[PDB]
Design a protein around this ligand. Structure first.
Ligand code: CHL
Ligand code: CLA
Ligand code: CLA
Ligand code: CLA
Ligand code: CLA
Ligand code: CLA
Ligand code: CLA
Ligand SMILES: CCCCCCCCCCCCCCCC(=O)OC[C@H](COP(=O)(O)OC[C@@H](O)CO)OC(=O)CCCCCCCCCCCCCCC
Ligand SMILES: CCCCCCCCCCCCCCCC(=O)OC[C@H](COP(=O)(O)OC[C@@H](O)CO)OC(=O)CCCCCCCCCCCCCCC
Ligand SMILES: CC(/C=C/C=C(C)/C=C/[C@@]12O[C@]1(C)C[C@@H](O)CC2(C)C)=C\C=C\C=C(C)\C=C\C=C(C)\C=C\[C@@]12O[C@]1(C)C[C@@H](O)CC2(C)C
Ligand SMILES: CC1=C(/C=C/C(C)=C/C=C\C(C)=C/C=C/C=C(C)\C=C\C=C(C)\C=C\C2=C(C)CCCC2(C)C)C(C)(C)CCC1
Lengths: 165, 226, 64, 41, 105, 74, 197, 80, 74
């Protein structure tokens, strides 16, 4: 009960939205025989809607004055109250993959720039080495940290093209 | 030197071919240990993780074994925290956490300054005169009062045999504690009870039959049964 | 004779050049006493599309 | 096969193989699992 | 309420005494490192009527007859500080005796 | 927008503006329930100026009819 | 002349050599280029004395049982007469304010015109009635002192302010609480010291 | 008209005078380059500023520079 | 013209942080601002636009004119 938001389990507007969705989904059920493939698809859609409405509730989710679930973004407020699962862990979940992509791209860039006429490697990819780096990028933050520490991550400006202002 | 192989026929890394280490099996496909000081820091991290894994897994197992034998009523580890929190003569959780963090920060700063500057904790007149024995023999092997029974100041053969044994039981304990966490997460019971279920009924009690470990397998089994 | 060795990598310090703080390979150094006798070749083209440029003696140094 | 696998390592290995793999992967997570909002494991 | 004559007089006497016997040695050192002999010095250089306005006045360098360097302009400034402080104290007393408490409780 | 198109508006990402609501509660807005300073009677910031302009500012900021510090959603 | 090391095995920093109270402190290399280092010394050597005076005042109002340090500046509110050492002070709030803001002004003003660093740090002369600074060995011994207890004084003043910020209790009562039940009455049990307890 | 200036970085490739369809540029003998040639612009008032010489210039940066401004009846390319 | 006051060039040249935090600091900036009219114009326009934004954000939430809040279109 933070930011004036009621929990999804104890929200009247959430249940109103749920029963409105159930009503509009059951409206289309009356135009098909129960032993039909469109009827089976509509029943599967209704089951998925009910499962989504059940799982969104009692999962540390809040909604306020609209029946639509809200997300808590400030860490700490997502820690003492059970709201870390909204954005706290998935932030690191995205960042792990983003650093993975950046690290394997950097590894391919260095390992291609040390090859004769290296401009063709960007249009003519090599698959074994790119896949080898693709399955070696799980420990991307450790490699990035050690490369920053030893100085091979960055390059001396002396060797960087600089605008002549 | 090079003892065994984690994968026979695999191309061992160049920084592991002629490297004198405890439990070196060539297992570094990501080449995180190519840099030497990197390897030193990772060796120290593996040593501390493994040693606290010995302590943790022993706390899992020996009270659990004695509970299975009926000697003591000590509960399983996943509810033991709530058991002590709800106890009568209990230090509060905040006080315990802060005391643990303070003491571990002190000792880990000691170990850290040992790591960055070797033998730097032996500065004279710094820790009540007892710091003269705080010199580190090797990375992660301090010695001194950390070996009060004198089991390390012998010939190097039993010394690095013991180092290999320590790293082997430590890796085993680390995977064992990962297992304890996972098999509480899936089965919801203690590891001794899980071992009893697997010994008494191996086929019907496994990681595959439990739907948390591999989702969608239960649906496959139900569809195949019908 | 008065410039860098032919085939040696040099660093261009000319500010208005496209290859400022870049590394190029010397292909010829003129000995007739002209304004920009050092001729270098770069692996990356400029916006005009050329890869070679001429610089003076003070505009080239050995890269570290 | 050498000439063919040299062509197959150009643009479709990154423009099609990655695209199809990442797409169909994500399709199957969104299919077998329903639509999630909170990471509650 | 505090008597306004005695409050204003005490505040301006304290500020003038501070500015003469206390901060006058600290004063003019900032001017030695601001407009000093080797510093920026003159604001303007030209010799037209619109430049003589920026030139320093004629009554501010006449070696005022005080034993220290306390001139008329310094007297005016420190008296202004004293009047400001006395009015601040009187204003605080006026807020106090009206039954209104501005301080946190 | 595509989530609202598929008839399921509850699946849209509604990140609550916790920072600005926390600031508003720090200014005396009691709607969000954050019992911070200038909204609690025990805070020194509320006590300082409690008889100066707090009963006017609090009355003006707790009224949603005016445009002073409107309630903000996702 | 190095007193000790704040972390055993620290890198020897050459810009702190020879200073009184010399540990190998300052990780962030503050005042490394000299200059402000003299300013840092002349500011620390008086912050120490001011915290010493403040914590002495708090301990004197506590152990003699003449009031509480936080409740001491409460005579201005509600308009009752000030009392020092039990004896009623006949002065007025406006009067004490006036003498304070002119006396500290003249003190800092005549302090500011020393124009030499050694007297700015350690005046002596008129600021030496009994004269225990005459012996240079005892001078360095007393310079190593008043800095250790001075830094401890600054930490103690911060601790007094923080302790009365969380729990509105006298500091002597908090000391008695930590003496009685240390594992139940500590900084982690007051609630607002760390988030989440 | 416009201002056309040639700097000493020119090496006498005599292709900037071919790319200019107005006979603004000319090649004069020089001694600061291997080719012993230098671009000169005697008929600068006939230039329109089409920057074709700058396109044809191989030096980095450009040896021949054309600066716009002060348009006339010949610099605007007007046949009327 | 009087002996008291502050010199802008002295303040600009004096505010140079130690250890080369901003290099030379604000040294040589007084003549740069004074000689260049475009610098003063840009600073004035920046402050004027920022304060016009401030005026816009503060007029609607705190109306200073009677019956201005009732006039919605205004
Ligand atoms: C870092 C290692 C560490 C691990 C793996 C665990 C493991 C666990 N702790 Mg223990 N603790 C840890 C930190 C610490 N705990 C405690 C003291 C407690 C208490 C007092 C409680 C937990 C309990 C729990 C459980 C919390 C989740 C749960 O089951 O709720 C679902 C879980 C089994 C809780 C528990 O048993 O709940 C079932 C509980 O109440 N922990 C301390 C001492 C200050 C810790 C310091 O590091
Ligand atoms: C306790 C020690 C202490 C500390 C912490 C400071 C701290 C500071 N002093 Mg210093 N100072 C000290 C003691 C200290 N002082 C002493 C003892 C003296 C001698 C008397 C001085 C004399 C002194 C002078 C003379 C000056 C300072 C200044 C400064 C400030 C800037 C410092 C600097 O180099 O810029 C920081 C270093 C940088 C390299 C700047 C990088 C800035 C980045 C690039 C900008 C990032 C922008 C980013 C996108 C913003 C995003 C915001 C978002 C909303 C969009 C800083 C607040 C300067 C000042 O007043 O400035 C305020 C100044 O001119 N100091
Ligand atoms: C982008 C900046 C930002 C902002 C505006 C907030 C805002 C907030 N945080 Mg958060 N926080 C942030 C970033 C931010 N956080 C980050 C990056 C972390 C690290 C993970 C935290 C860790 C954190 C914790 C651990 C806690 C907060 C809490 C709070 C709340 C009260 C803070 C307070 O009163 O300060 C007081 C400041 C005094 C000097 C408030 C909603 C607290 C909370 O839940 O409030 C109820 C709380 O316990 N924050
Ligand atoms: C993997 C290679 C790679 C890496 C490590 C970086 C890293 C960076 N870029 Mg760059 N970028 C890349 C490729 C890369 N970029 C490509 C291919 C483009 C063209 C679309 C750009 C366009 C670009 C712009 C326009 C900007 C950056 C910026 C940045 C910085 C911010 C980080 C970020 O996420 O930016 C965001 C990056 C993107 C939006 C590009 C995403 C494109 C994909 C993900 C890259 C695909 C590469 C591929 C997977 C590698 C092959 C793998 C190998 C195994 C075969 C950072 C320095 C910003 C900057 O300057 O900040 C300092 C900035 O403004 N980048
Ligand atoms: C987190 C604990 C941990 C740490 C710090 C290390 C560190 C090390 N071990 Mg070890 N190892 C571990 C756990 C660990 N291991 C476990 C659990 C096993 C059993 C499965 C092994 C089995 C093993 C063998 C067989 C060998 C090593 C070797 C090594 C070295 C390789 C260095 C390296 O690649 O970077 C250090 C690696 C990390 C810091 C890991 C980063 C964390 C990842 C990204 C997450 C993994 C999660 C997991 C998959 C679940 C180094 C001393 C080799 C050696 O002696 O070389 C000197 C060797 O032969 N180890
Ligand atoms: C790249 C994303 C991705 C991923 C992760 C999968 C994964 C899977 N698919 Mg899928 N599939 C994909 C792309 C993908 N596919 C594409 C691009 C298409 C269209 C051509 C399909 C069409 C398809 C059909 C038609 C079926 C599957 C099925 C399956 C499952 C059984 C295969 C198996 O045991 O593999 C190992 C899996 C380990 C988890 C498996 C979970 C089958 C299924 O539903 O499962 C029984 C099935 O019938 N897939
Ligand atoms: C940047 C903005 C943004 C953000 C933050 C999101 C975020 C989200 N959207 Mg939205 N969306 C976006 C843009 C965005 N989307 C756009 C532009 C469109 C229009 C095309 C949509 C259209 C859209 C629809 C129509 C739906 C979503 C849904 C979702 C959810 C995805 C959850 C999921 O699939 O499970 C989590 C997914 C994963 C964890 C993926 C797994 C990938 C990681 C890396 C693990 C790797 C897999 C595997 C283990 C790897 C190991 C094996 C491998 C080596 C082979 C999430 C709330 C769905 C939802 O749930 O609604 C709430 C939904 O119904 N969105
Ligand atoms: C493996 C899946 C199939 C890969 C096909 C392509 C392989 C490269 C094709 C290629 O060129 O192979 C050649 C070479 C062969 O490796 P080795 O013979 O040294 O054996 C090491 C591994 O390949 C064993 O799988 O591969 C590598 O060096 C890359 C190894 C990447 C790491 C793979 C094993 C470790 C995986 C760890 C997963 C969990 C990590 C968690 C933390 C991030
Ligand atoms: C506030 C953030 C300030 C970032 C400043 C970055 C300067 C970056 C910068 O100036 O880099 C450049 C600088 C020096 O680089 P050099 O050019 O000397 O590198 C050597 C190479 O060029 C040749 O070997 O520092 C580093 O490379 C190491 C920086 C470590 C930084 C560690 C992290 C510190 C910031 C952590 C912020 C955490 C935020 C979240 C908290 C919850
Ligand atoms: C805490 C403190 C200073 C702390 C400094 C720290 C942490 C320094 C940090 C760094 O080291 C790091 C971490 C790392 C380094 O790389 C950098 C530096 C920067 C060096 C000073 C307190 C300084 C505290 C002082 C001066 C206290 C003065 C108290 C007075 C005057 C009290 C008076 C009264 O209490 C009475 C007597 C009675 C009451 O009724 C009324 C009142 C008025 C309250
Ligand atoms: C000679 C002599 C003397 C005397 C002196 C005197 C007498 C002086 C003068 C005078 C004084 C004694 C003072 C002065 C002052 C000045 C000034 C200049 C002031 C000012 C003020 C002001 C500015 C104010 C303001 C305000 C207002 C208007 C209102 C409101 C508030 C305020 C505050 C804001 C003696 C004996 C000591 C010694 C010997 C010699």
């Amino acid at each position: 009960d933070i930011a004036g938001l009621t929990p999804c389990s104890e929200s009247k507007a959430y249940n109103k939205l749920e029963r409105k969705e159930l009503k509009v989904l059951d409206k289309r059920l009356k135009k098909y025989e129960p032993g039909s493939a469109p009827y089976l698809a509509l029943q599967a859609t209704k089951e998925r809607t009910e499962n989504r409405f059940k799982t969104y509730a009692k999962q540390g989710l809040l909604c306020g004055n609209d029946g639509l679930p809200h997300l808590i973004s400030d860490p700490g407020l997502a820690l003492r109250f059970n709201h870390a699962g909204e954005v706290f862990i998935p932030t690191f979940g995205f960042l792990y993959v983003a650093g993975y992509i950046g690290h394997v791209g950097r590894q391919y860039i260095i390992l291609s720039k040390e090859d004769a006429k290296p401009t063709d490697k960007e249009i003519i990819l090599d698959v074994p080495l790119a896949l080898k780096l693709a399955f070696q990028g799980w420990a991307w933050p450790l490699a990035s940290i050690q490369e920053l520490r030893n100085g091979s991550l960055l390059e001396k400006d002396e060797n960087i093209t600089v605008s002549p202002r | 030197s090079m003892q065994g192989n984690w994968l026979p026929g695999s191309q061992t890394p160049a920084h592991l071919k002629d490297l004198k280490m405890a439990g070196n099996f060539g297992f570094d496909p990501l080449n995180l240990g190519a840099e030497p000081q990197a390897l030193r820091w990772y060796q120290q991290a593996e040593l501390v993780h493994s040693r606290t894994a010995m302590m943790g897994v022993a706390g899992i197992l020996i009270p659990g074994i004695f509970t299975k034998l009926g000697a003591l009523n000590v509960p399983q580890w996943y509810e033991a925290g709530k058991v002590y929190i709800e106890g009568e003569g209990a230090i509060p959780f905040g006080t315990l956490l802060m005391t643990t963090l303070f003491s571990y920060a002190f000792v880990e700063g000691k170990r850290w300054q040992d790591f960055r500057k070797p033998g730097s904790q032996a500065e004279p007149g710094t820790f009540f005169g007892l710091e003269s024995q705080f010199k580190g023999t090797e990375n992660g092997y301090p010695g001194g009062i950390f070996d009060p029974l004198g089991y390390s100041k012998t010939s190097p053969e039993k010394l690095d045999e013991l180092k290999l044994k320590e790293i082997k039981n430590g890796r085993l304990a680390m995977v064992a504690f990962l297992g304890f966490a996972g098999q509480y997460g899936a089965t919801g019971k203690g590891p001794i009870d899980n071992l009893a279920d697997h010994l008494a009924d191996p086929w019907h009690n496994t990681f595959a039959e439990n739907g948390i470990s591999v989702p969608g397998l239960s649906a496959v089994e139900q569809a195949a049964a019908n | 004779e008065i410039g860098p060795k032919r085939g040696s990598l040099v660093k261009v310090l000319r500010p208005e050049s496209y290859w400022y703080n870049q590394v190029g390979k010397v292909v010829s150094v003129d000995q007739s006493g002209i304004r920009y006798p050092v001729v270098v070749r770069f692996e990356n083209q400029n916006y005009a599309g050329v890869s070679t440029n001429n610089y003076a003696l003070d505009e080239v140094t050995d890269p570290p | 096969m050498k000439d063919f696998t040299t062509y197959l390592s150009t643009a479709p290995v990154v423009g099609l193989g990655w695209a199809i793999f990442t797409s169909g992967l994500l399709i199957e997570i969104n299919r077998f699992f329903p639509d999630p909002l909170v990471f509650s494991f | 309420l505090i008597a306004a004559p005695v409050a204003i007089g005490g505040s301006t006497a304290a500020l003038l005494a501070l500015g003469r016997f206390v901060f006058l040695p600290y004063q003019r050192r900032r001017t030695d490192m601001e407009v000093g002999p080797g510093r920026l010095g003159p604001k303007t250089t030209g010799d037209t009527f619109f430049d003589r306005l920026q030139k320093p006045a004629s009554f501010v360098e006449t070696k005022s007859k005080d034993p220290s360097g306390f001139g008329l302009i310094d007297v005016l400034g420190w008296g202004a500080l004293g009047h400001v402080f006395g009015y601040f104290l009187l204003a605080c007393s006026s807020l106090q005796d009206a039954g209104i408490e501005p301080f946190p409780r | 927008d595509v989530v609202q198109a598929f008839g399921t508006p509850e699946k849209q990402i509604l990140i609550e503006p916790v920072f600005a609501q926390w600031i508003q509660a720090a200014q005396g807005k009691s709607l969000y329930g954050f019992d911070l300073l200038l909204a609690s009677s025990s805070s020194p910031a509320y006590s300082a100026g409690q008889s100066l302009w707090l009963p006017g500012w609090l009355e003006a900021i707790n009224n949603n009819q005016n445009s002073l510090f409107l309630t903000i959603g996702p | 002349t190095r007193a000790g090391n704040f972390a055993p095995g620290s890198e020897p920093k050459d810009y702190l050599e020879g200073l009184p109270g010399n540990y190998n402190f300052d990780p962030l290399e503050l005042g490394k280029e000299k200059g402000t280092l003299q300013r840092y010394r002349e500011a620390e050597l008086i912050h120490c004395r001011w915290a010493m005076l403040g914590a002495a005042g708090c301990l004197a109002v506590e152990v003699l049982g003449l009031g509480n340090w936080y409740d001491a500046p409460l005579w201005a509110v509600t308009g009752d007469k000030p009392t020092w050492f039990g004896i009623e002070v006949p002065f007025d709030i406006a009067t004490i304010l006036g003498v304070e803001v002119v006396a500290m002004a003249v003190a800092e003003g005549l302090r500011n015109e020393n124009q030499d660093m050694e007297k700015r740090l350690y005046p002596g002369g008129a600021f030496d009635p009994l004269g225990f600074s005459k012996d240079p060995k005892s001078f360095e011994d007393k310079k190593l002192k008043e800095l250790k207890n001075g830094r401890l004084a600054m930490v103690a003043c911060l601790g007094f302010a923080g302790q009365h910020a969380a729990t509105g209790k006298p500091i002597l009562a908090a000391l008695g609480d930590h003496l009685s039940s240390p594992f139940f009455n500590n900084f982690a049990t007051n609630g607002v010291s760390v988030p989440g307890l | 008209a416009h201002v056309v200036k040639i700097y000493d970085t020119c090496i006498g490739c005599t292709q900037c005078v071919r790319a200019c369809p107005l006979d603004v540029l000319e090649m004069v003998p020089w001694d600061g380059c291997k080719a012993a040639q230098m671009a000169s612009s005697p008929r600068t008032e006939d230039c329109v500023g089409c920057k074709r010489c700058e396109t044809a210039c191989p030096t980095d940066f450009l040896s021949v520079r054309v600066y716009l401004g002060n348009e006339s009846t010949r610099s605007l390319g007007l046949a009327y | 013209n009087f002996g008291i006051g502050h010199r802008l060039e002295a303040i600009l040249e004096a505010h140079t942080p130690p250890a080369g935090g901003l290099g030379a600091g604000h040294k040589g900036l007084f003549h740069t601002v004074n000689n260049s009219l475009h610098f003063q114009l840009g600073l004035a326009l920046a402050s004027v636009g920022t304060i016009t934004s401030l005026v816009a954000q503060h007029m609607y939430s705190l109306p200073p004119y009677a019956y201005l809040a009732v006039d919605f279109t205004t």
